Each structure stands twice: as C-alpha cells, then as structure tokens.
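Reproducibility note. Readers wishing to regenerate the assembly model reported in the main text can use the exact inputs given here. Chain order matters: entities are listed in the order in which they were concatenated for prediction.
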Amino acid sequence: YAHSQSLDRLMNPLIDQYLYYLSRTQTGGTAGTQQLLFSQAGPNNMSAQAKNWLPGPCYRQQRVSTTLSQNNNSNFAWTGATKYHLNGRDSLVNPGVAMATHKDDEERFFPSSGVLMFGKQGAGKDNVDYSAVMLTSEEEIKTTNPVATEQYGVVADNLQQNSAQPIVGAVNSQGALPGMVWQNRDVYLQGPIWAKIPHTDGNFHPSP
Amino acid sequence: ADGVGSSSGNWHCDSTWLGDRVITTSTRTWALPTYNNHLYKQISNGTSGGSTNDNTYFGYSTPWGYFDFNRFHCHFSPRDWQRLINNNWGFRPKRLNFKLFNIQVKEVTQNEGTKTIANNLTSTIQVFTDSEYQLPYVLGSAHQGCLPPFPADVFMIPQYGYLTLNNGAQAVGRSSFYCLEYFPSQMLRTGNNFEFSYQFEDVPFHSSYAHSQSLDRLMNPLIDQYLYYLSRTQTGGTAGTQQLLFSQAGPNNMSAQAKNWLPGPCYRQQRVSTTLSQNNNSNFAWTGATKYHLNGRDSLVNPGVAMATHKDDEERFFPSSGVLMFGKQGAGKDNVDYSAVMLTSEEEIKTTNPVATEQYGVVADNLQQNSAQPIVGAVNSQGALPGMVWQNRDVYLQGPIWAKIPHTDGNFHPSPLMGGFGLKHPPPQILIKNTPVPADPPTTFSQAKLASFITQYSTGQVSVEIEWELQKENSKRWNPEIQYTSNYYKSTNVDFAVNVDGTYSEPRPIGTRYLTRNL
Amino acid sequence: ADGVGSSSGNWHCDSTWLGDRVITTSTRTWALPTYNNHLYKQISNGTSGGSTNDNTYFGYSTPWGYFDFNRFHCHFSPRDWQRLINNNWGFRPKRLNFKLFNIQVKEVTQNEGTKTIANNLTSTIQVFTDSEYQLPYVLGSAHQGCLPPFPADVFMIPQYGYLTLNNGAQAVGRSSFYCLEYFPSQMLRTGNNFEFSYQFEDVPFHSSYAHSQSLDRLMNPLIDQYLYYLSRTQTGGTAGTQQLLFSQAGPNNMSAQAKNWLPGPCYRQQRVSTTLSQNNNSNFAWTGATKYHLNGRDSLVNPGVAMATHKDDEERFFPSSGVLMFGKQGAGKDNVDYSAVMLTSEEEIKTTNPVATEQYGVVADNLQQNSAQPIVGAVNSQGALPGMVWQNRDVYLQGPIWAKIPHTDGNFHPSPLMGGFGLKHPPPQILIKNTPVPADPPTTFSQAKLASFITQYSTGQVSVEIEWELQKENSKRWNPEIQYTSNYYKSTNVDFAVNVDGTYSEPRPIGTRYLTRNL
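Running the prediction on these inputs yields the following structure tokens for the assembly.
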C-alpha cells in the first residue's frame, strides 16, 4: 500500500494550534532591534506547526539523471558512490536504507546505488546500456521517508550571540531518533522473497 | 422513556482517588453550528500568491464537527493535578467513557434585523465514532477546540477536515476523498442520548519524577577504578618526547572514568535568550531554525527529540523551536510579545539528556601521525547508539494527552514528541453533525440538489470519564522533596480562578516532574 | 415509543464484502412537495400546436411522489464499484430492504414577502408499495429523481404520473384511470416509520467480463479441417472454363473454415463521427435515424439491440442512437455540445456481436446460371437464427439496474435494452404523498370539495439495502488482466469527489467489463 497522507500533513487544515512558536526575532523597519514575537501556526503556515513525529533515517546518496546531458561529465560511479567501510574494505551500499527515489515532478533522477535494477530479457553481464535495465522506484514512501538524494534536514552549528550570526548545517546521514517512522523497501515480482538475519548480539529493524 | 420533557443525562464532574488509581469525570456544555452549508469542499494552497512551497496543501473540509478532549486540563483540575504530580512517580490512562445527552436542536430565523431562535423538536443530529480507524486522524495535532479547562465555560465544537497527498495545490492520483455520510451513524432527537466505552491499550507509565543522579556521576566517589585510561602521551619538559602513560581514574578525575552508558540522542537546535540584547540582531527565526526536509518541503522541528532546555545557571536561554509554548489568557494569534507566552522547561532531564542547544560531543576527524596533529569534530546530531538512555518530554496540565502512532513498517521509540502517550489504537474520533433540514421545495420536480435549508444549530452536554492508573512513590530519600506549591504571598487574583470580569486563566505551565528517583 | 422527541431510525450507509456476496446499504435525506395542489389532472398532447403525431400522449398526473433507486451509483460508491468490476465475472441482486424514518412535516406561511416555516406535529404522510403490480410501472424508463450518487446530497422526490391509450390528444374507451387513494396505504406522523423487504426473483448474472476470443477465431490455428469448401469455380487463364474445385481450410485461410456458430442479431444504425468534418453536412439526427413503427407512430430505437459501437481502430465513430449517453455535471437539458456529454462504448462485445453501424452480412439475391452473374445483397437487419450467440449491453455505475418485463404472451430474451436485469416481478413502486390539511371551512355547509389547504411539505431519511451475489473469477490466464484504474498523474480535482464549490461529479462512465473469459 501507499500512504494517502504524509507526516508533515497529518493536521486538521481548518483549525489553529493552541501552541506557539517563535515567529519573529527582529522588528521590521529600516533599523531593526531584537525582539521575541510568537505566533500560533494554523492552516496558513503548516510548516511551522508542532508535530509528534519525524521522518525515517537517511544515509545520503548521489543523484543521477536519466537525461545524460544533466549529469556531470566524469566517471563518478564508484568515486562519488555512497559506501561503507568494514575492516579496511569499502563496499557500495546497494540499495541501502529505504528512501524515496525522488521528490515531486522529478522522475528523471534516481539515487546512484540506491534502487533495485533489473535487466530486460537478454541483457548482458557487463557495461549494459540504460535501455536494457529496468529501474524500480520507491517514490511511494516519500510520505514518511526522506528522499535518497536530498539531505535529511538542517541543525544548528554554533551558539548564537549578537556578535555571531546563526549557522545551520546540513544532515546528510541520520541514525534513529525517537519519534521516527518509516516504510521498508518495496517487494517486486522478480525480487527476493527473504533473507537470513545474521546471528549477532544486536540488530536494528532487521528487515532486509 | 425518551421524550421532550425528560432529561437524558445528568451532570457528572469530579474526581475520585482510590488506591493506585484515580477516576476523573468532567461535563461540559457545547454548541454545534452548521459548517460549510452542509457541503464538502476541497481546500488547497499553492505556491501562487506569494506562499512558500513548504506551506502547500490539498484536502477537504467537511460539514461535520468533532469532539476532542486531548488536553489534561479537560480531565484534571489544578488541585487534582497537584495531588497527582506531588505524590506519584507515574500514571497512564486505563479506560474511557463518553456520553452525549440533553440535546437541543434550535432553528434561527432572521428578517428585518430581527433574530428569532426556536426549538425544532423533530430535528436530529448524527454521531458516530470511528472505531476501525478508517478516517484521517486529526486529534494528535494539538489543535484548539478541546473541552475548556473550566467547567462553567460553554464551548464551540470545531469543524472537521483533513489533508491528503498533493503536488502544489493539485491533487494526485493517490490522494483520497472521504464522505463521512458513507459511515453508519446514530441519529438523535432531543430525547435520545449517545454513549460508548473505550479501553486504552497497554502503555508505559509517563515518568513523573526527576533524577537525583546524572549518568556521568553514577560512580562510587570514594573508590578508584581497577581499569586504566591513557593519561599522558608526551613527557613533560622543554622538549617532550612521545610516550604512553596510563592512570586509574578515581574521585579526583571523574570525567576520565570508564562508564557503561551514554546520553540520549540529539538533534541540535539554536539558542535564544530572553534577554534581548544578547540575541543576534537579525530575523533568524525561520532561517536559523532547525528543520527536517520531506519531499522537497522543509518543516520546523517543533519541539523535536527531548533535550534539556538549558544547562546549569542559564535560564535565559531556550532552544528556538525546541520547547512547548503556551499562551496566557487572551493572547492573540499572530506576532505576540514574549510577555503573553508561557515557555516550558525540560531542564529536569539534563541528567540523561544532552542539552538542546549544545553539541552532543566530539569525535576524531582524522588518522593521527607524527606529521599530523589530532583533529576532533563536533557532533551536532546523533542517532541511537547502543548504551544510550534518555527521558521523554514532560507532560503539562494544558498539554496533549495522547497521539496516534502512524501505521508504518517501522518506528523508533514511538513516544509523541509533543508529549503524552503514543497509541496504535488511540481513543476514536467522535464526529457530530446537524442533519440538514431543507426548506420548502419548488412544487415542480427539479433534479438539482436542494441548496435551501433551515438555519439550525444544536447544543447539549458532553461527559467524559477516564480511569487513570497511578504508580506510587517508593523513595527512601531522607530529606524533603520539591513539591508544586501555591505562592503564599498576597495577590489581586487567585491563581487558577476567575477574575473580576469572570474569565478563567491558567497563570503558568505545570509540569509533572517533581519527585525524584535514582538512575 | 413513537414520539416527537425520539428518532425512528439511524443512518446506515456502507458496504460489506462477505465471500460470494456484497451488501450495500445507503441512506439519503429527501424532501417531498405537495404536487398538483392535491389534485389529479389529465395531461395530453395532440398534433395541434405544431407537435408531431409521434409525440402525442394521454395520461394523468397525480399528487403522489415516488421513491426510485434504479441507478447503480445509488447503492455503490466508486471504490466499491471498482472492487466489483475488477474482481468478479458477474453479479445479480439477491434481496432488498427499504426504510422511511425520521419524518418531519412542515407548514409554510407567507405574508408581506415574509416566509415562515414551522413544524406541524399532527400532520401525516401516506406511503404504500404496489406489491401486486396493479399500477402503471414507470420505474424502468430511466428518469431523473433517483437517490443522489453522493450521500451528502439532499434530493427532491419526483412526481408520479402515467400514460394510457390515446388517439391523438383524446382518450379511448380502453384508456384507464387510477386513483392512488383507492389503495390501502400506511399513514405516518413524525414518530412513525415505514419498512418493507423484497426478494429478487432468480435472474442470470450480469456478465462482467470481455471475451478473450472471437467467434470466427475459435479454431485450432495449427491444424487443417477435415472438411472441404468450394474454393474455385473457374479455371485460371486467358479464357477460363467453369469447374468445381475444393479445398480444406487450414490456418492459411481462416475465413473459409466451417463454423458452428453465428454472430448475434442486428438492427442496423447510422454511423456518426466525433470529428465533425467527417460527418455529412445536414441535420440527419431524426431523419436518418433508426426507428420502429408502432400504431402509426415512429419512435427512435434508443439504444436498441446490443451491438458493438465500432470495429478495430475506429473510436471516433458511434451509432447515432445506438449507445448510452450520460451528461457531465451541470449539463443542460437541450442542445448540449458534445463536450458536456459522456458516450459509453460497447466495443468489448465485438467478439460475438455485429458492429452497430455495419451490415450483418451478405446473402444471395438470385438464382445463378451461365447467363446470370451472381448477385449478393446486404443484410442490414437480422432476426434470431439458430446458432447465434450474443452479449447483452453493459451496465454502468450511473446506469439503470433493472426493468419490468412487460406482461405479454411472448417475449424474446427479455433483457432490458438499456441494461440491467429484466424482472417479471421487479422491486415494487413506493408511493408517498403529503396528506392534505384543509384550512378553515366556511362555517355554513357547502357541498363543493374543499379547495383551500395549508401549504405543507415533508422531509425525512430513506434507507435502502441490497444484497448482491458475486460470481468469482476462475481464470487460468497467465498474463495480467486489464483493470479499472485511477490516473496517477496530478490534477486540480480528484475524480469522483467534490470540487471547491462543493458539488460532486462523476467524470466518466465506468462499465463493468474488464476481466476476460474464453468463449
């Protein structure tokens, strides 16, 4: 199934919240002075409302376009790939944690190793053109799952003061936070049915 | 026995304290308008018009209203809330009972500026609960329209509406539409009443207490460790040479001891001061905000993962979006001064929880060698690590009781980030509507749907009863604990009481964490 | 328990899917005007006034209204209709349950442009079903006034009337008059309710599926026939001489093979193109129409016997009157453009059914001899021949459910030509009327019937429940079948949902034929 709602839209669109947020830190005008003003977020501003939940974890990956001219001219397949490092070996994360293939109105982009790839009948082993492969798409989970190529979000990088303007850094990889919800990767007619959970002291969400 | 001249219910409002449980029942008077002229309407917001992509939505507004009691002040009084928080380590809701009774439906007539209200004895209202969770669940979003905190206030029932998938202001094929008349509902006249019962699924006690220890201090202060750490990598002197020296960390050096546990996860946020001159001069509210990015939209993390509001001896600082904010009675909607808001504080959890503004810690950024000095980077956001322990965000007298855990393949620690109890099968939504009564039709047949109705509203009483289980405080502490207290000094008004003009106010947020425990 | 202040029913609207059956219940709100000022009136149309002989009629209009749910969208939602058509080979109605409840009767007062509506608690309505089929049965005529497809729409009850024999605008001795107060009926006040049950007579499943084969292709493509046909009557060459040569028809020539079956009957119709420039320039609508002639009157055959709308690769052509035509929401009555109508398509049946526009075939027109070259004429209309097989016309979400088979000495394949289930004893007619309440009489006796009444109308809720039997799909087909799908691409509105202004629309006709079977 796909969700008919998204985490950020779970609200009642007709009613304001009884809570507040920090709307404005400065007076408007030619020379502004610092202040703290607060607002209740209603339907007008949905992005600023308080919420109970967070999108699923991410491990960021590189964006490839099916239109060739949009891609960088270089061989970035392995070098720009998203990898994990185990006992001195680097191995591609293929496909990795479940993340949406793309956001709205971009179907030409897909994460480099971040999606399953099936061949058409008679496809070769090595260096096969894009026409013989069949790419899947996880976009159904973009309701709860961050997009594979884009950042998770932004967090504060410093302490603010009148001498220091705020700095906000991007979160490319995010482990589990309390309040996250996510969807597992989809299953396909030609895809794998099961896997063996390794025998280990611990695991997290042991879905293949 | 259902009739015009006999009441279908009584006013039950009070609490009773039995042993390990408390039962709080409360009754209110409500008024239900006709919404949308008995129509469903799609509502949407696009980027056109100067609005941001982040605020776009698509959905529907329904003629139905809904009952919501999701705030604690609905069920508890301020005196009952004090008995709870001072005497107990924890509590959770056991079960629920709901009633609608004494229903009046009235029609409104206007001509020549004259306005007449009269009983319509044959009109009905429709009520159903969504037991199978087949509708969008809007309750856990902390909206207005809950039962008032003060029992003598008559309140208006909020309109029901929901959102679904969109691209900009446009719907997508998956976006779904719900007719609430496509559900079986009970129809009631003035003699009829409505009731149902609900039982909460098993949920962990909310922890009402603060820790009397901190993770980093769990040690015996009198004894050394039998383990070692790397104390010194260089000889002292004018020209030092590299060496490896080791020490046992005792009471003298506590920071260097070995430990079994780690502080809870963090997602860092920006520090705002209540003293204005200390804040940067700029509008950093949205730009410097901590956000998450979902399908091309950025949304503020409000409040976010539970983290301490501030460290020791800084009460002027708070995380920008990282704490709950309540308004004082009569506060406006937009751009309200700091004086009208009431900020909460999570500082009680600074024992196990990293501070919201500060970093989690530092990790090595490189490989060290005699040609390369060590570099150590700051960790602003940290996901779950084995060995972490943390506290959930506190609950407040006026704060939300529960939320619905989304239905998903996976979740992590599904406690609501605003507060309260996460529930897979929460209390159902209770939807109510005035049944439309059309005016006289044309006397010659027309296929068009009837657009002309009698203006009506309905009033009545709603009663809700929750049974709460209590976790008694077993502490062996010698010295007296901190309690929630009313100020002894004189004042013009009593706190949590009506004023001269007759309006009820809550002067401050009251958290639940007062008694203490050991880690 | 019947009283003013207690409801006599509840709102039951939903569907439940159990195994081989589905039960769809639906509830609506209705309004009933007083018709004809409580009078029966004869109505007629003659040739005088420029009207055609074909349109003449004689009949009566009655003060009574009637309930009609004969369209599928009354009972099914668009989601339920999708579950039905995608998963099932067939369905038929098993049984029926009907209810009237929560009845308000209201009086209207007007003076000085002021309009007052009030309850009249002692007024009644009258309801009876015609169980013995003793009245003219008007339901199977595909009129307006059915329950709305959308449950939140309040609808007006249509006026009842009937026609009988005429010569021009004049009655004949056989033409009959019916008083509906000459039937026993139940009288209801606000506390009273009405109910009855009905069981459908046994009827063949509607076939929801398309054939994956065609009559002419039923053969084994790999094998020759052991039979022969006349392949060649003349020697090839410059001067040929007559001969008889015979061949066995194999895969190479399929058209010439022997076959056991024939396509269904046809009554030919005229071909219209949706591309305007291809159509003749003239008004051929009525003149070039296919008609039948009954007692000096010509009437269009609309739609007629079931025939394929078009052949392969021509979707622009459709038979003139030979297909059902639905309007888009808000379409007018008269001379509406092609853009507002929605045409259906029967092309799924082109496997067994001749195409509506094209001929049935060709037959010999003469006896052949060496002096007479063979002549072969076209068969535009073909009655039943032994060995024919055919499909009935498809049923649609907004199309008619059933019809009453006329009571006659004989019929052939009594399936309704518009669609649905032919029934000798269909669901009865449900007739409803506001009982007249006269104003004050003169206080001195007068024999004249009272012409002065209190203006009244009534409202209430109607609930109907049908149990449908399902025929599950047993197909062993390997490749995936065609399904009914919502478009994935973005749009301003959701299909089958309300818009910004709040009106519900059905964007397209949805037929029932998607899954496939073998002949």
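We highlight two features of this model. The radius of gyration of chain C is 28 Å. The helical segments of chain C are 72-75, 78-87.
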